[PDB]
Write an enzyme that holds these catalytic residues in place. Sequence first.
Site, short mmCIF file in Angstrom:
data_model
loop_
_atom_site.label_atom_id
_atom_site.label_comp_id
_atom_site.label_asym_id
_atom_site.label_seq_id
_atom_site.Cartn_x
_atom_site.Cartn_y
_atom_site.Cartn_z
N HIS A 1 41.16 30.06 39.67
CA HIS A 1 39.86 29.91 39.00
C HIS A 1 39.43 28.44 39.05
O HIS A 1 39.35 27.77 38.02
CB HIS A 1 39.93 30.38 37.56
CG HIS A 1 40.51 31.75 37.45
ND1 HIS A 1 41.87 31.95 37.34
CD2 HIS A 1 39.96 32.98 37.50
CE1 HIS A 1 42.13 33.24 37.32
NE2 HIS A 1 40.96 33.90 37.38
N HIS B 1 35.29 37.05 41.16
CA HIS B 1 36.27 37.01 42.26
C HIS B 1 35.73 37.78 43.47
O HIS B 1 35.86 37.33 44.62
CB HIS B 1 37.60 37.63 41.82
CG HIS B 1 38.43 36.79 40.89
ND1 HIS B 1 38.76 35.46 41.11
CD2 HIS B 1 39.04 37.14 39.74
CE1 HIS B 1 39.53 35.05 40.10
NE2 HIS B 1 39.70 36.06 39.24
N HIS C 1 34.38 38.99 35.09
CA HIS C 1 35.40 38.13 35.67
C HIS C 1 35.80 38.62 37.06
O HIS C 1 35.80 37.86 38.03
CB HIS C 1 36.60 38.04 34.72
CG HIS C 1 37.74 37.21 35.20
ND1 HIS C 1 38.16 36.07 34.52
CD2 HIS C 1 38.59 37.36 36.25
CE1 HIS C 1 39.20 35.55 35.17
NE2 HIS C 1 39.47 36.31 36.24
N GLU C 2 36.12 39.91 37.16
CA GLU C 2 36.51 40.48 38.44
C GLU C 2 35.36 40.41 39.46
O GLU C 2 35.59 40.15 40.63
CB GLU C 2 36.97 41.93 38.31
CG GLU C 2 38.18 42.12 37.40
CD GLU C 2 39.35 41.22 37.73
OE1 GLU C 2 39.59 40.88 38.90
OE2 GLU C 2 40.03 40.82 36.75
ZN ZN Z 1 40.97 35.97 37.57
#
Ligand code: ZN
EC number: 3.4.24.-
Length: 185
Positions: A101, A86, A82-83
Amino acid sequence: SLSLVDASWELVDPTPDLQALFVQFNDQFFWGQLEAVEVKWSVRMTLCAGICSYEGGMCSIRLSEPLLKLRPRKDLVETLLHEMIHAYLFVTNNDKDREGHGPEFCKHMHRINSLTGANITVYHTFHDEVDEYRRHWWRCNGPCQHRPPYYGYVKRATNREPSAHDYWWAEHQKTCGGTYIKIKE
Ligand SMILES: [Zn+2]
Ligand SMILES: Nc1ncnc2c1ncn2[C@@H]1O[C@H](COP(=O)(O)OP(=O)(O)O)[C@@H](O)[C@H]1O
Ligand SMILES: [Zn+2]
């Protein structure tokens, strides 16, 4: 195979190799593009299982040792991925979606889930957690985004914005002086 759902996905890993995972995932899922990004454990952090900080440049990811050390492998891996999404959107100057998101995030999220069988998600709680978490989020736009142990975050139960009302406000004014931009509620 790029499948991550193996025998050991639902089990705690006593000796995770966060650097190895990062190197593997940069190669397998992000076309090598995260060279400038660094990834570190934090033994101090708790407001977020994972964060990024962007110099706006160099990108940093931090994973919570307190929140992840005793959790199944899947939770480390899904948090890290997830990170890294980003981070990828930052590195490639494609982080202009209004939402935290938005569609760009879901493209990588959906795609990596397809390749691996994992379930990276747009929310930042664990799948097993119940609904007793704080939903109102701010992040400081000053240097304290990089500073342990909060990385700029304030997470509250109501739309109660950071202010002189807070016991720590004067300190933050002296040590950072940044402004708390509303993100979660
Ligand atoms: Zn996030
Ligand atoms: N010096 C500081 N600089 C920036 N943020 C801080 C500082 N001290 C505390 N905070 C913020 O306050 C939070 C701790 O607040 P807490 O005592 O749990 O009361 P509350 O119920 O308002 O969250 C931290 O998680 C962080 O968001
Ligand atoms: Zn700050």
